[model samples]
Structures are given as C-alpha cells and as structure tokens.
Target: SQLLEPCSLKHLKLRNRAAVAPMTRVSAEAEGAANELMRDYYASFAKGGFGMVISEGIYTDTAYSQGYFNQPGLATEAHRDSWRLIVDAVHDAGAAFVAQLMHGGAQTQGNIHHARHVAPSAVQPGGSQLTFYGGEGPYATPAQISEDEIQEAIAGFAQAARHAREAGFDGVELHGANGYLLHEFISAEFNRRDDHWGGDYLGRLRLPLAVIAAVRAAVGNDFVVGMRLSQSMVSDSQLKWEGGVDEARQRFRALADAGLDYLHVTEPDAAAPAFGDGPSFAAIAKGSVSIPVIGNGGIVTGEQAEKLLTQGDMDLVAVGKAALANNDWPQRIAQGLPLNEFDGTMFVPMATITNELAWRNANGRSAL
Candidate 1:
C-alpha cells in the first residue's frame, strides 16, 4: 500500500505516510527565537517516530513579520543561529525538519514590528481580534503595498529559505494558506485592487507564483519546496470558485505547474464538516497535480492516515492537533498499541509535557 511504502522527499526519506504538521505553540523567547521549551517540544515528536516534522509558521522578515508576541523568526543571522539548535535536536532524534516561512501582511496584529502592515489591497481580514503585545483591535485595513514592497516580500521568503538550508533544515514550506499575506492576495474577498495583482483569477494568483519562483531560484531545484494552501481564508471567505469544480480544478492546476515538491491542502472552513473528514480535499486536489499531496485537518489516528493514503487521495498524512496530543502516535500505531484521545481543554501552555507523558505511557515507557 502507498501508506506503507517509503516516501522519499529531496534528501530525506520517510518510512511511512505520517508527518507532524506545524502547530503554533507560543513557546519562543522574546526575540522570536526558539527557546529550550520549543526545542524539547519538537524533539519529542522526532523521537516518537514522526517521519517528517514541519516547524510552526516562522516570520520571514523582521520589520514586516512579528504578528504574535513570541512567534519564531528566521529573518536574520541571529534568528538562523537560534533555529540551528532546534533543527539539530530534531535530526538527532531521527526526523526530517522543514521550516514554514510566513508573512502576516494585512492580518498583522501591529505588535510584531513597528513597520506598517501592507497587503495586496486595503481590505481587512474579517472576524478576528488581535490582542498581542499590549495592543488589541479587530482586523485593521492594511496599507496597499507597492510593487517594490511586493518584491521585498518575495525576496524575504527566498532569504528565509536560504537561511533554513544554512541552519540544517531538510527543506522549506511556504505558508500560502490561511488568511495571511499570501492568501489575502489570492482571495477575492480581500484583494480588490485594479492592478496586475488583482482583477481576474490569474491576477490574484500572481504574487504567490512569483514568490515560489523566487524561493525556488534562491534554493535551487534540489531543495524541497512545499506549499500549504487552503481553499478558504482565515475569515472563512468562500473560495472564489468560477464554476465550482471546474474553477477549482483550473486554479489548482496552475499551482501544481508552478514547480512544487509537495502540495499541502488545508481546509479552514468552520461550517464545512467535510474539511474535517479524511482525505477529502486531497481527492479534490489530486486531479490538478501530479506531485505528492499532503492532507491536513482533523486527522487523528494511524488508521485515518492509512485510509487516506490507501485510498489514493493523498500521498502523506499531516497530523496537527493530534500529533501535539500524542508524541509517540506513530510508534504506538506501528506496534498495534491503543491510541489515546486528546483533551482539547488542556491544549495549551503545558500540552507538550502532558502529551509526552501520555504517549510514553501508551507505548509502555517509563514516565519522563
């Protein structure tokens, strides 16, 4: 079955279909660098047998990124050094690491850096509150970025990819999903400009394609470049489907043609129960791309992962909240051990410690 087959990505090889999806755990230090806590958090998953693990979204540019109070950054040399420890720890524990590069754009919470938040248009990300760094407000109307600023954003992603390689990461993943800068431009609800970056469907997708090209050029062809995209934005805006299935097929075809090693599909539509189902989106995106497709969102057990791959919907299964709740999930499932359910109420601050203990017990190991 494809689930049991070895998956080779760039220079990294996975023994199975399981991957630890990037989950933001506010464990960074004041300088937006990974601290001891963050290092241990990621290393735990690697030790537990996750084939590949993606780091949480790390701001790419210092002046423009910094949305969360302690979100990690890879924008400078110091930031690069800070991430080396975490990367090495994951490698030593026997797992591949991919850094997720992201930019906040109009959704910026204003406390990250003093620089003004710029987007493709002046629209605001609907239905969210920003309360980080002593500042609080609903989404604010973003400054319309000029062509030069757009170039800088792309360059920033490329520079960040270079840094990820220098820091011993297996590859880089672009955060083109959710309601961040890249998704903002792709969504019709937010992007209302009359320029080259807006107007028709092709125009809306221009920025992300350019960014991918820049990153690919900077890192060369051999480096693994994964793109994480969602049909829905953070504000729950509907995908700008021209004719439903046909429209989605065309859009996804273009993205696949843009040269990506992996296509990560995430569905953030709260009202849609299908988004939480196994491998649904993967099937939707499979017809549009030939590369490996990684399915994320509400994947819980190894059985669910196996089902997705065996069904030919996705090549890999990315577990997010589930992986956070059970570090040794892969090992336990492989050994035919019982899977423990996660408690959503206790999913913060000390989730790492609790999850580690739970997984160790389920795997018959001594408590940490």
Candidate 2:
C-alpha cells in the first residue's frame, strides 16, 4: 500500500511512489534523436503502470559525455523535437516523465565527440577510455577545463534544460553522481585544484550549485528539478566520499538550499549502514532535506521497495535493472501476474534490447 501511494514533487503529483530508474540503452536512431525503437522501449514502461519514468541520462553538452555512440541528447531542435515523441508517448500512457541530464567528464572515450575530455582538474581517472560505441582499452588522461569552459558548461546545462522544457519533459534531473562532471568536482580524491570549483567542501560544492542555479533560472520554480548523487563510481564501486557522513549531510542541505525539488541517492544497498553505525545514505541523507528522497540501487522486489518506505526514511523507490526486465512490474504485482527475472545479459546494445523486447512482446509485453 505504501509503494502504491501517491506522492508530490512541486506542482506535480506522481501517480505512485514507484519510479523507473534511468537505464541507459544507446538507441538514438541518428544524431541523438529518439527513434521508433526508442519510442516503443519507453512507452512500454509508462503503459506498464509506472507512476513516473526517469529517462536515461541525456547529455546536456556535446564537449564531454558522448560516452556512447547513439545516446540521446537535448542540445538541438531535432533532439528536442524527437523527444516530443517520447514525452507524448509517456503522457499518453498516463505517466509523468523526467529527463536525466548528464555530463560524462573524464569517463568519455572521446571517440564520438573527439573532445579533450575536461573535469574539475587535470587528474586522469583510474580507468580506460573506450569508445562511445563500446570498446575496451585504457581511458585517456583528460585535460583540465579553463574557467571560460566552466562557464560554458554551466550555460550548456541551462540551455539543455530549456530544450527539455520545450520538448515537453515534466522535469529535469541533474546527474551529480557516479564520478561524472558534477561528482568530479565534489570528490576530493579526484579534484586537486584550489579554484572556486575545487578544494574544500564549499569549493567542491560550487559547480553543482552553479549548475542548479543556472537550470532553475532557465526553467523557473513551477517545474520539477531533481538531482542524483552517489557514494561510488561505476568504474570502481568501493569509492566513498573523502569527507564522509558530515560532509554528505552538509552537501545535501546545501543542495536543498540550492532549490532542488527532490534528491535521488544511488548506493549499492539502500538499507545497509555506511560511514558509521547508523542507517544507509538513503535514510541518513534524508535527515538534511525536507524534499522527497528517492532511494535507488539494489532494490529488486515490491516487498523491498515497501520496506524502505515503511522505515519512514525514503519517500520513494527507483527500480533500475528490475524495471528493465519488467515494464509492467507494478501492474503484474498488483494483478498477481507472472513477472520476468532480471539477469546480467540484459540491456547490452540496441539490437540486443530490441531483440529481447521482441521476444518479451511475443509473449504479451510492451514499453512506453
């Protein structure tokens, strides 16, 4: 009952407490535009019964974050127009949709955009720079971006947010997690600069706030603007914040003050205690802000989602790989119908996803 309850974010009321976590599958038909396959993929989720759908991280700028060859973008009118199809599909399916805006930073392979990837500092990350099309090799060392470029990146995010609004997205969720551009500035381990964008907590916290302010200015107060933060990197999952718990609290409070409507915290285990003898980041981070907190990562079942809600810690739950397998997960659980189990081999490439989806639909399934 808790998971099925309605929830509000600003002027919007989500139909349920469940949200579809952004899952990336590079399927832009061309030039980062939404294609027929993309339409079917997302429409199925909205129609399946998700109250809200958070789309995969769409790059806000072209200089960095072209991590994948066919990933969708919001930087152009064609991109915006193509997104209208997706937004229309989602709305038609009776679900609210939010586009997750992201910048890859040093993680980009530099194959598609051929950009000299930039970050908070010139520090090379701890991994390889495979092509956006999926290859395995050593990641190139990224050069540091200048102050002018920093201004450009912030403006890019604002511009992209405007495009998202024009494209009919209900809101935009900034990707400030997983060692990307925003997190790169936040992490003490990577950022070695003494500029306003790096150094101590306040210094490192500068960029995110600036981006948030720019986005808010572009979209206004009525639109829902959320943020995602993580304690680890996808390349290296064991990474923790150098400042630990107190810092997390302060940064979260700062973000709330920066005018975020909601926060999505990603962790390996939303229920596991970390950095001390208390609750997980999901529960602990909820202490610093009054807005809705959506706990994501490692949540698989309806029971698991309800347990987090029952704890009175997290207001909502985001189902990622689980949602990938079953778009109608909520409806199935509600109707007592059969459901699909998630496996590692899922969501590899466009053809693979389309093929698997075809198989699933042949047995009576769909996407929105």
Candidate 3:
C-alpha cells in the first residue's frame, strides 16, 4: 500500500508515507528545554511506526520566535544539545525527524518572554489573545521590524537549521503557515508596509523564501528543507491568500525552485477545493513542480490516507491530532487493529498531558 511504502526527501528517507504532523504542545520543561516528557511524547510516535516526525514549532530566536511558554528552541548550544537525546531516541526507532522553525510575529506578547514583539507591521491580529499560551488580552501592538532585524531573522532560521543539523535532525521545516512572522509578512491585512519585505505579494513572500534559500545554503543540498503553507491562519479564518489558483501555482513554483524538498499544506480538508469545484491545493498545486507535497488535516486512517493519495496525488499524509490519540496508529493500520477516536479534551498544559494519555502511550505495544 502507498501508506506503507518508503518515501524519500532529499537525503532523508522515511520507512512509510505517514509523517507526524508538527503540533504545538508547549511541553518543553525547564524553560524552553526538552525534558524526558517531551522526549517520550515525541519518541512514542517513532516507536509506534511513524516514518517521519516533525517536531513542535521550535523557536529559532530567543527574542520573539518563542510563542508559547514551554515550547522548544534551537537558538543556543544548550537547546541543540538537549535535542540530541530526542534525535537519538527517534533514530533508535528508525524514524526520520525534522524541526519546524517558527516566529510568533505580531502574535507574541513582548512582556512574556523578556523580548520585544515584532512583526511585518504594527498591526495586531484579530480575536482574543491565547492567554493559555502567553499572549495577554486586548493584544499589544507589535513594533514594526527594521531592515537589520529582518536580516537577523533570516540568519536566525539558517542558524537554527544548522543547529538542527548538528543535533542530528534529518531536516528543517519552516513554519510559513499559521499567523506567525512568516505568514504575517505574506498576508495583505497584516503587512501594510511598502518596503521590499511587505508591499506586494512577492514582497511579503520575500522573507520566508529567503529563509528557505538561506537554510538550504547553510544546511547544504543534501539536507531536506520544506515549508508549511496554508491559505488560512488562526488569527482569522477569513484572511487567506485570496489570490486564487494562479497565484498559488506561482508560490508553489517559487518554493520548488528554492531548493526545497517538499511542501506541506494544511487545510481543514486536504482534498477540498480552494477556489472552485475543481481540484484542491494538493491536487492542482502539488506535483506541478519537481518536489513532493504532504497533504494534512483530517487524515485519520490508512484507508482515508489512501483515498487522499489517490484523489489529490498527495505524496504523503501527516497524522496530526490522531497521532496524539493513539501512539500505535501505524501498527493499528498495519495489523488491522481498531483505532481510537481522538479526544480534543486531552489538550492540556504542556508536559502535563493526562495520566490516561501517558498510560495509553507508554503502556502500549511499543512500550520499552
């Protein structure tokens, strides 16, 4: 079956097409450092048979990239060193891992992490703040990023990817999706600047694409680099690219030509059409370029994944919330076992996931 088959991304190879989707648990203990909790949480997916494990959004810069309190980072030697054991555990289970580098952009609260908040523009995102994750209510205005800071931000991504490489990661995935710094630059509502980094569509896309090039250059042609893109974000669902298919295809080509190995697109439904009753983003945009694409969202079962692969030509399927529900997901499908229904209430404070969940994962078939 396609889901059980091997897939290759640049120099990294996956044992199967199922990849662990990068989901933020904010589980890093001891102040942005990975503890045994984070280690076991991630390593369980690998042990359960996920081919590739994309870690939670790891901050690349200490100043503003850290959106959540306990999120992981690759900004310092300590962070890189802390990740070594994580990589070792995942590799021991024969799984490839990638770090998803991110910056909160206007979504951050400056007072929280001892750093000033920055974004493409001073504009704030819509809705109430995620106080549970760190942002205070009424949403503070973000300082507009300067040219030097932009350069530093680009360098930070490259540096983080370098650190990930040293930490024994297979590759790095840029968090261009969601309402983060990268998405802030690319969106018209958030980025009202006339500068090269935020005016036109091409201008807004400059930072993320530049990071892609810089990271690829830093990590070399062998290291895998990919971008996670979505038409919509968490700040406001209405705020999408809105430019239609021609524009998406243009963006797809830019990413493919930028030495990226793959493109990961997240939508409520991976196969749903973006503009019309025609093909979805994965259907029309993916495979148009030389690189592969991972279609995410609502992918819960092997049969469901097979349908997505057949319908949209998706190269791989990212198991997001479903993986949290069952660590033995891959095994269940492989051996024709029943899968558990995902419990959204299980979303709790980082590192302190429910004892029931801990037991479910640790006491599973992959138990050490």
Candidate 4:
C-alpha cells in the first residue's frame, strides 16, 4: 500500500499519510488561549511523526461562538499572539498545522456564552441534550438569524482566517460538520427559511459556500482551504428530508466544485467499532470528488489506514481518539509496539500533560 510513503499536499509535504484529527482537549487557560501546556500537547504529536495536525475547534466570533469555557479562539489579535508559541513548537517538530474554525450556533449552552443562541431557523435541533458546567439540559431555542446577521457570520469566518494566517498556521479548515453554525445552515431539518438563505438543496448550502468563498478571498489562493462535512447532525439525527441520497450527493458535489483543497468526510457514528470496515461514506466521498478525501471515524492502526488507502477509498486517515490515547501512535505502530487503551477520565482535566507523558514513556524517555 502507498500509505507508508510520503504524500505531498498543496503547500506542505508530509513524510507519511498519517494525520492527527482535531479533537477538543479542554486544557486551555481561562482566557481561551493556548497555554504552555497546549503548546507541549501539539509539539508531542509532531515529535511522534504526525504529518498533518489540525488544531481543535477554535471559535471565530468572540461572543457567542465560544461553546466551552476553556475552548480556544482566534477572534482577536491577542488570541493570535497567544497561539504563536504553540504554532512555532509544532512547526519546529516538523509538521504542518491547520486551524479548525468553528462557530457554535444553537448547539451552545447558555452558560458558555452571555449572548443568546442563534440558528438558521428558530427551532432547537432534535435529539441529545448538552452538558454545560455540570448541568445537562435541552438546547436553547435559538433566535432566527437575519440577513445582516448571516453576513456578519461570514465576515467573522473571513476575519478569523486572517487571524489564523497571522498566528503561523499553514491553512484553515472550516468546521461545517457536526451540526455547528455552517451545518445548521446546510441541514434541511434546521434550515426552514424561504428566502435565498434556505429552502431546497442549493439554498440550504448557500451560506456555507458564501462563507468559504469569502474566507478564500480574504486568505488568497495559495492558502490551503478545507472543510469537514457529515450526513447527520450532532444530535445524531440524519439530515434526510425527502430524497436523502440525492440531496447529500449534490451537497458533496457542490462543496467539491467550490475549489476546496481537500474534503474531510466524517461518519455519523464516529465511535462505532466497525465504522471503517468497508464501502461506506468514505467510498461515497471518493466517488463524488476528484480532490483528496480524508476519511475519519474508527481508524486506529496502520493496517486499517493502509487498507483504506490501498483500495483507493480515501487519501488520508484521520485518527482522533486513538491518537489522543497515545501521542506516539504513529511511531509506536511503525516500531511494532502495542497500542495503549484510552482512559475516559484522563481526557478532561489533564489531557495535555497525560498525553505528553504517554508519548515520552512510549518512546523510552523519562517523564518530564
């Protein structure tokens, strides 16, 4: 398989096909800045041989977009300054970095933000509740975003891309997946507007496309721009309105036509054991676009990654929870070492410190 070989992306050349998928580790400081601990967190991954590393979900808007108390943001110059140390650390360790920009629409809990929640429609996204500050409850009824508000959201994304560039990131990935702001605009269940913003397929995707275009214009043609998309909401409900497959295929094709450098396809059930076993969303995505497709969900070992790439099912394998469990995962797998089991409890409070220690120990170095 070609998975063990080098893969050259647009602006960067990777030593292998392995990449670290963006996973939120809530270890940021109180001001939502990447602290020294977070810098070490990413540097460990780079040292462990992750070719491409996408940072966790970062809020583009300063106000309501910060869904978690310790979530990082690139909304201000100060935030960009705060990220410089972390970006330098990653690059110095030989890895390309990309910022994942996100906006929490109605998915945000009230405790996270002082402002009111907003969505495409005024309805709450069905299924699961949000756990915020130790309180579990249903998502708030979001205010319907006006035309001007939509424009502001687009501008916010563009501005954040500029900030990301200043922060020494190689590229920017728009977080359109998992029922965030962009996902809310794309899904028919949430977008019930009759105007240009929502209705049928094209209208539903208008806002996201516009946001992408605006961000591309702001960042220029040379910057690597990518997007993540899923067929279901974060609440675990499928976005099938009437003609499900046709709607999804058209949406995928439109995103491809928008000049994206890469397409990231994530499955609905990301944690399911047999998620990447055969022809699924990864196969569907490969057929839809000519560009490289990064297939994510349930990928753990090099053999699994190699199988997917050898079959021409995906161009890259995005490793999330597995990578979090062991930062030296790529190096360990290459050296024929056993994989470590992830502890759910260690992810919340000391993810950075714990993961860094795991890598050190796996590589036969004393704990720092």
Q: Which number leads on TM-score?
A: 2
Could you give me the TM-score of model 2 versus the true structure? 0.94
Query: How well is each residue in 311-356 modelled by candidate 2, as lDDT tens digits?
Result: 9769989998778778888887677676677754343333245656
- How does residue 319 of candidate 2 score in lDDT? 92
Query: Which lDDT tens digits does candidate 4 get at residues 1-368?
Result: 36657887776788877788987665676577778888888888898888889999888876667766677888888888999999999999898999999888878743244658878999976665544222256777789988877887788899889999988999888998888889888877788998998988777889889988999998998888889887666675555433445555677789878878888878744333213343466676777778778888878777777777887777888888778766777778788887766555443334455554665566564321
Question: Lowest lDDT 10-mer window, candidate 3?
Answer: 347-356
List model 3 lDDT by residue over 157-242, tens digit each.
99999999999999899999878889888787888888778767766788888898889888988888889988777767556574
Scored by lDDT, the top model is 2
Tell me the TM-score of each prediction against the true structure: 0.88, 0.94, 0.93, 0.89
For model 1, what is the alpha-carbon lDDT of residue 300? 80
List model 1 lDDT by residue over 92-168, tens digit each. Answer: 98888999999888866644566578888877667665332223556777788898888888889999999998999
How many backbone clashes does every candidate have?
1, 10, 0, 0
Sorted by TM-score (best first), the order is 2, 3, 4, 1
Better of 1 and 4 by lDDT: 4
Q: By lDDT, rank the candidates, best first.
A: 2, 3, 4, 1
Compared with the true structure, all predictions reach lDDT values of 0.76, 0.81, 0.80, 0.77
Badly placed stretches (over 4 Å) of model 3 are: 109-115, 131-138, 349-368
lDDT of 2 at 273: 73
Candidate 4, residue 273: CA error in Å?
Answer: 14
Error of 4 at 95 (Å): 0.9
